[PDB]
Amino acid sequence: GSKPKTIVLPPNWKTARDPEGKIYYYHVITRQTQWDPPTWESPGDDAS
């Protein structure tokens, strides 16, 4: 199924939480940030 995992690429392309438990997500391409539905997890990048 499309169940995501906490997969950390060195800087971006990934989703993670900071010490406060709040998620932040970046995609490596432009080092862009999103407002897209909070997801601490990661199907790589899909509808998880």
Curated annotation (Swiss-Prot):
Free-text function comment from the UniProt entry: Histone methyltransferase that specifically trimethylates 'Lys-36' of histone H3 (H3K36me3) using dimethylated 'Lys-36' (H3K36me2) as substrate. It is capable of trimethylating unmethylated H3K36 (H3K36me0) in vitro. Represents the main enzyme generating H3K36me3, a specific tag for epigenetic transcriptional activation. Plays a role in chromatin structure modulation during elongation by coordinating recruitment of the FACT complex and by interacting with hyperphosphorylated POLR2A.
Record remark: domains: The low charge region mediates the transcriptional activation activity. The catalytic SET domain binds histone H3. It is also able to bind oncogenic histone H3 K36M/I found in a number of cancer types, in which histone H3 'Lys-36' is replaced by a Met or an Ile residue. When binding the oncogenic variant histone H3 K36M/I, the SET domain undergoes dramatic conformational change to accommodate the histone H3 peptide, leading to sequester and inhibit SETD2 activity and block global H3K36 methylation.
Localization per Swiss-Prot or TrEMBL: Nucleus; Chromosome
Residue ranges occupied by any WW domain in the UniProt entry: 7-40
Source organism (scientific name): Homo sapiens (Human)
Tissue: Ubiquitously expressed.
Superkingdom of the source species: Eukaryota
Protein name: Histone-lysine N-methyltransferase SETD2
Subunit structure, as described in the record: Specifically interacts with hyperphosphorylated C-terminal domain (CTD) of RNA polymerase II large subunit (POLR2A): binds to CTD heptad repeats doubly phosphorylated on 'Ser-2' and 'Ser-5' of each heptad. Interacts with HTT. Interacts with IWS1. Interacts with p53/TP53; leading to regulate p53/TP53 target genes. Component of a complex with HNRNPL. Interacts with TUBA1A; the interaction is independent on alpha-tubulin acetylation on 'Lys-40'. Interacts with STAT1.
Signal peptide residue numbers: none
Modification after translation (UniProt): May be automethylated.
Disease: Renal cell carcinoma: Renal cell carcinoma is a heterogeneous group of sporadic or hereditary carcinoma derived from cells of the proximal renal tubular epithelium. It is subclassified into clear cell renal carcinoma (non-papillary carcinoma), papillary renal cell carcinoma, chromophobe renal cell carcinoma, collecting duct carcinoma with medullary carcinoma of the kidney, and unclassified renal cell carcinoma. Clear cell renal cell carcinoma is the most common subtype. Luscan-Lumish syndrome: An autosomal dominant syndrome with a variable phenotype. Clinical features include macrocephaly, distinctive facial appearance, postnatal overgrowth, various degrees of learning difficulties, autism spectrum disorder, and intellectual disability.
Similarity comment: family membership: Belongs to the class V-like SAM-binding methyltransferase superfamily. Histone-lysine methyltransferase family. SET2 subfamily.
